[PDB]
Design a protein around this ligand. Structure first.
Ligand SMILES: *[C@@H]1O[C@H](CO)[C@@H](O[C@@H]2O[C@H](CO)[C@@H](O)[C@H](O)[C@H]2NC(C)=O)[C@H](O)[C@H]1NC(C)=O
Length: 402
């Protein structure tokens, strides 16, 4: 059956107010998921063993959230609970990818990591590992790894080692290719595929305020928008893996549940059409405090709704631009006023466009979807009354014809 890999970022239980999303809060999502990917573990740069990113939260000596997550497998029949390592959330050094490269460089360091994965899965009763490896990201338009060729071969060996250590206990091992990770530099697909239960293509964040502060564009297109960066769309990345010989059933497509916003200025123009000049991220989400980053509930609150129908200023509803091609995605915007104020351009996933991605997976015979992430879906049903609308629309279109 098709996979639905649902990420829960445990950091969200640390948030304040309506930003706090706990394990309990995401339980209503679990009937729609085949796997719960608990995010995120990291790597100790001195021992190369797995580490929790917040020990006080995750470990038995603290709040024990690892075990709260794995207990879910005893209340939701057939649900598999994996631990995801990396995800670009392991951010404790100035170059957060460096330890993900040096780990690969010796049998001793690879073995330390493998042994620490096995011990961690057993200790906390995880069902397997999602390898969301923090390779360096390709630089934004305007050398990535001088030892890329060495590291590519060492990564094949690491994945082989993990598989051989995990197989006796039937632990799941999957690979997640994070945004802007170039597989043709770092990954030997024909020598990886046989050791992986899935390959999850996190084909989103194609444009972001952090990488492209001066230009807004579609964050998660299915196909290539005209004259964009070749490869940076779902169809291109899935086809890359297929053309390397990967079984279609092993390929899973990542779907974001969030939006990213850019501040608009005078040089942005007045049409809202991308790519659009900008000046960094827009205002932080009301419930998270993260600049230019919005959960689906936060995006939907900015779109035309009865509460803000005739509101003005920072509250004036955004203009939605639907995508009739269904190839590129939705965006919404407010042109800056005559004082260059309150301008925002927001590219986001919604239930309809997430459904389009799941329907693409079904039509192409791929293996499933992943959801990045449950807590950025509309957990509480604030947008339209229905909880987990993005997840539910994607799951529905993954299995039901249009
Ligand atoms: C990933 O790396 C490869 C090289 O390993 C890049 O390959 C280039 O692809 C473009 C088309 O997108 C070609 O015009 C170039 O001739 C290719 N060069 C090489 C050396 O192969 C690829 O573009 C990279 N992709 C990203 C997104 O960075």
């Amino acid at each position: 059956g098709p996979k639905v890999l649902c990420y829960y970022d445990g950091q969200m239980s640390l948030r304040e107010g309506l930003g706090k999303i706990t394990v309990t809060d995401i339980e209503l999502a679990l009937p729609f998921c085949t796997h719960l990917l608990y995010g995120f573990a990291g790597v100790n740069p001195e021992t190369y063993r797995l580490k929790a990113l917040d020990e006080s939260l995750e470990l038995d000596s603290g709040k024990g959230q690892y075990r709260l997550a794995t207990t879910l497998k005893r209340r939701y029949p057939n649900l598999k609970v994996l631990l995801s390592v990396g995800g670009y959330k392991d951010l404790t050094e100035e170059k957060p990818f460096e330890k993900y490269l040096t780990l690969l460089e010796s049998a001793g360091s690879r073995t330390a990591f493998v042994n620490s994965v096995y011990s961690t899965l057993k200790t906390y009763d995880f069902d397997g590992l999602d390898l969301a490896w923090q390779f360096p990201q390709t630089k934004p338009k305007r050398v990535l790894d001088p030892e890329a060729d060495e590291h590519r071969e060492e990564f094949t060996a690491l994945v082989r080692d993990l598989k051989n250590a995990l197989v006796a206990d039937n632990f799941i091992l999957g690979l997640t290719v994070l945004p802007h990770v170039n597989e043709s530099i770092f990954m030997d697909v024909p020598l990886l595929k046989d050791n992986l239960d899935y390959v999850n293509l996190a084909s989103f964040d194609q444009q972001t305020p952090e990488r492209n502060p001066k230009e807004g564009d579609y964050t998660a297109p299915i196909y290539e928008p005209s004259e964009r960066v070749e490869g940076n769309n779902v169809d291109a990345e899935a086809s890359y893996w297929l053309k390397q010989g990967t079984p279609a059933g092993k390929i899973v497509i990542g779907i974001p549940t969030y939006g990213r916003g850019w501040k608009l200025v005078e040089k942005s123009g007045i049409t809202g059409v991308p790519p659009i000049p900008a000046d960094g991220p827009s205002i932080p989400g009301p419930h998270s405090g993260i600049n230019g980053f919005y959960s689906w509930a936060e995006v939907c609150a900015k779109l035309p709704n009865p509460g803000n129908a005739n509101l003005q200023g920072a509250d004036q509803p955004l203009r939605k631009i639907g995508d009739p091609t269904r190839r590129f995605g939705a965006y919404a915007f407010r042109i800056p006023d005559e004082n260059e104020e309150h301008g925002i351009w927001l590219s986001y996933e919604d239930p309809d466009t997430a459904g389009n991605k799941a329907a693409y997976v079904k039509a192409k015979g791929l293996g499933g979807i992943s959801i990045f992430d449950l807590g950025n879906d509309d957990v509480r049903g604030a947008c339209a009354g229905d909880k987990f609308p993005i997840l539910r629309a994607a799951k529905y279109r993954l299995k039901h014809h249009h």
